[PDB]
């Protein structure tokens, strides 16, 4: 019998917003640039994707939290930068 925690994990995995093959290939490219020949557990790729998507989302959350305007408002690179200086690290 499968416990709910397992189901929770797998469910979270199906909710990722980035296509899995392009992500896999991005990892591949980076390893090529690093000139590293190592193998990778499929689990490690999954970990990388979940973490990366979390990092990006947190970046936008931080920008959102630092933008106090209330006009219809577009986020630019400087907003990103400011939010990172304020809420980052």
């Amino acid at each position: 019998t499968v416990a709910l925690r397992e189901i929770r994990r797998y469910q979270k995995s199906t909710e990722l917003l980035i296509r899995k093959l392009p992500f896999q290939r991005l990892v591949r490219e980076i390893c090529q640039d690093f000139k590293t020949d190592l193998r990778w557990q499929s689990a490690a790729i999954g970990a990388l994707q979940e973490a990366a998507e979390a990092f990006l989302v947190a970046l936008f959350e931080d920008t959102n939290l630092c933008t106090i305007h209330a006009k219809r408002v577009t986020i630019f690179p400087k907003d990103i930068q400011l939010a990172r200086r304020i809420r980052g690290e």
Partner: protein, 203 residues
């Protein structure tokens, strides 16, 4: 029927086993170029498993909820005014993944609640109220998403274990610190790069 349910549970267990086996698979660089690689096959199995769980719950006539923290209602009690609070709560509890409000949404909520009930609130106090609420719930939503992340992170391989090897190895620790410096720098670089592109595409 009991037999059907039992059967579905067995199938769930099967898919879990297969997924674990795929998770342990060691991909070389070639396989990282493969659209059919163990990673993608794993993802497919996960989808199958989730659908199956749906069917299973419909057979038991129980909810299909998995007990994710992210599906819990987030209360907002922050002000003296229950009407404002209520609007804020309904705002951050909207159906779907994309619930996260911006400041404007929060301000508009506070204003509509203050007008509907004629609370006689000056714009300075309305604004400070909105700012504090937006901060509260923004931080709350962030931390909830974070909790959801660390709750569901990893697999059976990370279930086993554990102590960071760098704590017993000063050389490794040094290398990791240097790596950290490099990391922070490169991040700053890409960020400021696009900021400066913005500045040059202004003036």
């Amino acid at each position: 029927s009991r037999r059907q349910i039992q059967r579905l549970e067995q199938l769930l267990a099967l898919y879990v086993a297969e997924i674990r086996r795929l998770q342990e698979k060691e991909l070389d660089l070639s396989e990282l170029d493969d659209p059919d690689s163990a990673y993608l096959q794993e993802a497919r199995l996960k989808r199958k498993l989730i659908r199956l769980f749906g069917r299973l719950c419909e057979l038991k006539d129980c909810s299909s909820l998995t007990g994710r923290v992210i599906e819990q209602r987030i209360p907002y009690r922050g002000t003296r005014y229950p009407e404002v609070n209520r609007r804020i709560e309904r705002l951050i509890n909207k159906p779907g993944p994309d619930t996260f409000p911006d400041y404007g949404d929060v301000l508009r909520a506070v204003e509509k609640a203050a007008a509907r009930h004629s609370l006689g609130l000056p714009r300075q106090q309305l604004q400070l109220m909105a700012q504090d609420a937006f901060r509260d719930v923004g931080i709350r939503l962030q931390e909830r998403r974070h909790l959801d992340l660390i709750y569901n992170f990893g697999c059976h391989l990370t279930d086993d274990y554990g102590v960071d090897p760098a704590l017993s190895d000063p050389v490794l620790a040094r290398r990791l610190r240097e790596n950290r410096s490099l990391a922070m720098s490169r991040l700053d670089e890409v960020i400021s790069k696009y900021a400066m592109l913005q500045d040059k595409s202004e003036e």
